[PDB]
Amino acid sequence: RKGIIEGEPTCCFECVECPDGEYSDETDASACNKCPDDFWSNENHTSCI
Amino acid sequence: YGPDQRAQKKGDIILGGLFPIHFGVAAKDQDLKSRPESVECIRYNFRGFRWLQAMIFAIEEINSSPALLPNLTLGYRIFDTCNTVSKALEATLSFVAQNKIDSLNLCSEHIPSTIAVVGATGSGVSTAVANLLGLFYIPQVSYASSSRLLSNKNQFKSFLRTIPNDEHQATAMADIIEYFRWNWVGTIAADDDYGRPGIEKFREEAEERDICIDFSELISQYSDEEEIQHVVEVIQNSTAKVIVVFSSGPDLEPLIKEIVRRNITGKIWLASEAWASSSLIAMPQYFHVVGGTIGFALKAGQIPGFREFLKKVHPRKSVHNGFAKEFWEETFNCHLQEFRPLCTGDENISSVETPYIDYTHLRISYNVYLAVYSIAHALQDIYTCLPGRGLFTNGSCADIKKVEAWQVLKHLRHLNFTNNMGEQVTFDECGDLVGNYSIINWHLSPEDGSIVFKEVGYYNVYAKKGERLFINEEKILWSGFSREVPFSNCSRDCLAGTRKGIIEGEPTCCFECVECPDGEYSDETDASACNKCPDDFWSNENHTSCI
Amino acid sequence: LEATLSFVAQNKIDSLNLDCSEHIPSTIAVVGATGSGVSTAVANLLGLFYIPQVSYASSSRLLSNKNQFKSFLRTIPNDEHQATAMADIIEYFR
Amino acid sequence: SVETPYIDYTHLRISYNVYLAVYSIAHALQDIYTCLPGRGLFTNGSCADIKKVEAWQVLKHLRHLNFTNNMGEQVTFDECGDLVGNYSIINWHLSPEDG
Ligand SMILES: *[C@@H]1O[C@H](CO)[C@@H](O[C@@H]2O[C@H](CO)[C@@H](O)[C@H](O)[C@H]2NC(C)=O)[C@H](O)[C@H]1NC(C)=O
Ligand SMILES: *[C@@H]1O[C@H](CO)[C@@H](O[C@@H]2O[C@H](CO)[C@@H](O)[C@H](O)[C@H]2NC(C)=O)[C@H](O)[C@H]1NC(C)=O
Ligand SMILES: *[C@@H]1O[C@H](CO)[C@@H](O[C@@H]2O[C@H](CO)[C@@H](O)[C@H](O)[C@H]2NC(C)=O)[C@H](O)[C@H]1NC(C)=O
Ligand SMILES: N[C@@H](Cc1c[nH]c2ccccc12)C(=O)O
Ligand SMILES: N[C@@H](Cc1c[nH]c2ccccc12)C(=O)O
Ligand SMILES: *[C@@H]1O[C@H](CO)[C@@H](O)[C@H](O)[C@H]1NC(C)=O
Ligand SMILES: *[C@@H]1O[C@H](CO)[C@@H](O)[C@H](O)[C@H]1NC(C)=O
Ligand SMILES: [Ca+2]
Ligand SMILES: [Ca+2]
Ligand SMILES: [Ca+2]
């Protein structure tokens, strides 16, 4: 997940790992999506199981 | 040889002048079915006629003083430019006739010569005039042109000015925006040599200061309906309340009229000194749009007996002045006999309110005054030199009887004298002066009902960076009636329990608020990331602090 | 500017009414300069006498204003397309 | 025997614009030359005299110019006095035989 660097333009950022119950399945994604009601994320938060 | 109407007097040394007695030329379309003819100037400028009288007053004051340039006489040759390049170019070609005759080797054989010219008002007109005046090394002293492109001495070899350039105004506007804690603004500039470099300088400074600019548009005096409507649509589609305008009254009036007719209110205008005191924009009918403007003003000077000289103008006594006839006719709305009524000729000029004598401070007239005295004192320095102490090859002195233009320019380059206000006047290596700035606010008069300019601070250029700006906030009305500072940020501040977010395709000034995960906390009012909790500790439910 | 002042000698003499040589050729048109800064300075003087000027290298967009430059013509495109093409090239290679 | 950019070139790009600039004026003068009465661009359809032509008449004829060059294409100026033209993209290499 993209992270803000203060005092710098938008083209320069940093990456942060998504939380335990959320996932990110793209590249250069600015947010982590939540799994559905009866789904939980796996070890790499790249998909819901 | 030259234009028809002019102000002229005879003397041993002749000075030239260019003043905008008219606001512009007729908006005619050019078709070449027949031979083109002279274009006409349309709108009268009462303020520009007062600037002309300052030069004549200064010359007559020098000619009557035995202590300055004794036994010599100063003449003048003043033309009208109508803030257009072509008229000024015709006048300049009238100025340099004698030098050009020998330059081209192409009759009269006896014509008066000009040693110096008091410059123009606009920066483009000044550039065009200087390009031709520097060919023959004729010095030119300007009183209102402040473009930073005119400081280049490789191209403008004989240009001097008695006004500071436009770097400090851009820096001061950035300082004001930083002072009032705004980070979301828009910009509008005039498409000429005055607005573009100034707005570019403002753009650079602000970026260094982490200020986001939403839109940037260019305008002109001869813009059509489509461009004006596009600019108006751009403005009202934005959520930025503060707009910085680098331009003049003639170049800004159409956009202001179009905005006024649409009733667009709630904007905060930052004004440059070109239109911060203009009477074309400071109208009572526009106060619900432009009320509460903050702008810059130059320093004021004192001329002890200027108003008495101003009040003595007459169309039948001013033989040497050719603009007084039209001044009288425009002032009293009558026709002078060689359907308006015939002018009686004994009508007081105090009855009719015009910018001619309805002023509070002398700012540009003082610049004209100083421009005349600079040339006078350079001539005096030429006159009172001794052999072996000259500035020329072997210490020689130029002859006062046979003086030449380049010698006067050389002596102007080394000028150092005191004025009637007790201060010193020297031009730097770029031919520039330094001066303070004043900050004004647009109010509404309770009794008269007109617009009143009120000073609320100043800008000090002789101080160091970061301590130049002074503002007294208790004297500011933010729209003519309000007492609270407006909000002009892109988005609200994220609270202490959240952090910042990224919006795709948008600048850094606009963000979202996202809560902190369990086991983390933040304690700032704008947090890029949610900080973790120390070992053997856990975050509170609100994630405000660890427990 | 020195070379241009000799192009408009007869017209300038007629305009100022100063009036000698009795034989001065008149220039119909001028093949413009190379740089844009020189072209503007030359056009400011030529447009006074409505003398056409055709430039071959100047490509600034400031010369497209017909309120200021009445008799200026070009055989080369201006630079707006060039700037757009540079932006397109930068976007193409990511 | 001496290598100078005078005759060391592969294409004519800017020197071709001067050629076209001269032919533009020449064709404007030619169009002045063959003006039949009643079909002029001036007042009441009158034409100008080629023996006593003036600069503003040539400017008026230049503003309404539409002719063909030696390559078969059309040449005409827009309302701003400009033209339209294709661009070419090039890359800087090194000659192995010479350097
Ligand atoms: C609008 O944005 C500006 C720019 O960040 C804010 O000003 C900053 O406020 C923080 C909070 O105390 C200060 O630490 C910074 O020093 C300020 N920056 C500057 C340049 O002054 C301002 O607080 C925001 N205002 C609102 C109402 O959100
Ligand atoms: C520009 O403005 C500053 C501030 O108003 C002037 O500095 C003041 O000068 C007066 C005159 O001696 C002093 O009484 C004040 O104490 C000064 N104030 C400060 C903050 O230093 C400065 O003189 C002005 N510059 C010019 C050229 O007039
Ligand atoms: C350099 O930056 C650009 C982003 O500006 C990256 O280009 C994007 O790549 C993704 C994945 O292939 C595409 O889905 C986007 O459409 C691209 N954006 C653009 C502008 O087309 C690019 O991958 C980066 N290059 C490297 C090697 O990191
Ligand atoms: N400084 C302006 C000229 C100017 C100053 N004050 C003005 C008042 C009215 C009109 C023009 C002006 C410029 O360089 O162009
Ligand atoms: N056309 C350029 C100048 C230019 C083009 N080709 C050149 C070759 C050499 C020197 C200058 C040039 C301009 O607008 O100013
Ligand atoms: C001008 O003269 C004054 C004293 O008359 C002096 O203080 C000042 O430094 C001089 N100016 C310069 C630039 O040296
Ligand atoms: C110019 O001439 C060509 C050929 O006669 C013609 O097709 C064209 O319409 C004319 N006008 C323009 C603007 O090309
Ligand atoms: Ca920064
Ligand atoms: Ca005297
Ligand atoms: Ca964008």
Nearest of B546, B370, B512, B437 to residue B172 by alpha carbon: B437
Nearest of C23, C49, C13 to residue B94 by alpha carbon: C13
Best to test chain C binding among D19, D25, D54, D67 (most C CBs inside 10 Å):
D25
Q: Which residues contact B540 (CB under 8 A, 6 or more apart)?
A: B521, B546, B547
Question: Element (H or E) spanning B374, and its range?
Answer: helix B364-383
CB contact burial B214-228 (16+ within 10 A = b; e otherwise): beebbbbbebeeebb
Phi, psi of B309 (to 5 degrees): -65, -40
Tell me the residue length of chain B: 547
Do chains D and C have 3 or more beta-carbon pairs under 8 angstroms?
yes
Q: What is the DSSP string of C18-84?
A: ----S-------EE--SSHHHHHHHHHHHTTTT--EEESS---GGGG-TTT-TTEEESS--SHHHHH
B493 CB less than 6 Å from ligand 1?
yes
Nearest of B374, B417, B432, B442 to residue B168 by alpha carbon: B432
Ligand that comes closest to the CA of residue B436: 2
Give chain B positions within 8 Å (CB) of A16. 529
Q: Which residues contact D52 (CB under 8 A, 6 or more apart)?
A: none
Q: What is the resolution of this structure in A?
A: 3.1
Tell me which DSSP letter residue B122 carries. Answer: S
Query: Which tokens belong to B87?
Result: 């008229």
Inter-chain residue contact B502 with A7, CB threshold 8 Å:
no
Residue owning tokens 């003639």: B250
B451-459 contact pairs (CB < 8 A, 24+): B451/B282, B451/B283, B451/B284, B451/B287, B453/B277, B453/B282, B453/B297, B453/B360, B455/B297, B456/B294, B459/B168, B459/B172, B459/B175, B459/B296
Q: Return the amino acid letter for B67.
A: A
Do chains A and D have 3 or more beta-carbon pairs under 8 angstroms?
no
Rg (CA), chain C: 18
Give chain B positions within 8 Å (CB) of D79. none
SS3 state at B43: coil
SS3 state at B52: helix
Q: What is the DSSP string of B275-299?
A: TTT-TTT--GGGHHHHTT-EEEEPP
Ligand 10 centroid–CA B213 distance in Å is 11
Dihedral sign of CA atoms B301, B307, B308, B314 in order: positive
Pair B215, B192: CB distance under 8 Å: no
Among protein residues, the one whose CA lies closest to atom 19 of ligand 3: C94
Q: Return the amino acid letter for A8.
A: E
Pair B488, B182: CB distance under 8 Å: yes
Q: Which residues contact D5 (CB under 8 A, 6 or more apart)?
A: none
Mutate which of A10, A28, A30 for ligand 3 pocket (most atoms within 8 A of beta carbon): A28
Pair B464, B171: CB distance under 8 Å: no
- In ligand 7, the atom with minimum distance to the C-alpha of D66 is 1
Q: How far is CA B369 from the centre of its chain?
A: 17
Query: Which tokens belong to B336?
Result: 């002078």
For residue B122, count CB atoms less than 10 angstroms from its CB and return exposed for 0-12, middle for 13-18, buried for 19 or more: buried
Tell me which DSSP letter residue B33 carries. Answer: S
* H helix runs in B216-269, sequence order: 225-236, 249-262
For residue B135, count CB atoms less than 10 angstroms from its CB and return exposed for 0-12, middle for 13-18, buried for 19 or more: middle
Query: Which tokens belong to B75?
Result: 């003449």
Tell me which DSSP letter residue B436 carries. Answer: -
Among protein residues, the one whose CA lies closest to atom 28 of ligand 2: B436
Sort strands B74-80 and B13-19 into parallel, antiparallel or unpaired.
parallel
Query: Which tokens belong to C87?
Result: 């932006």
Subunits in contact with chain C (3 or more CB pairs closer than 8 Å): B, D
C27 CB less than 6 Å from ligand 5?
no
Give chain B positions within 8 Å (CB) of C16. 1-2, 93-94, 97
Query: Which tokens belong to B327?
Result: 């001044």
3-state secondary structure B513-540: EEECCCCEECCCCCCCCCEECCCCCCEC
Phi, psi of B370 (to 5 degrees): -65, -35
Q: Return the amino acid letter for B147.
A: S
Ligand that comes closest to the CA of residue B467: 2
- The span from the CA of D47 to the CA of D36, in Å, is 7
D76 CB less than 6 Å from ligand 7?
yes
Q: How was this model experimentally determined?
A: cryo-EM
- The span from the CA of B523 to the CA of B544, in Å, is 6
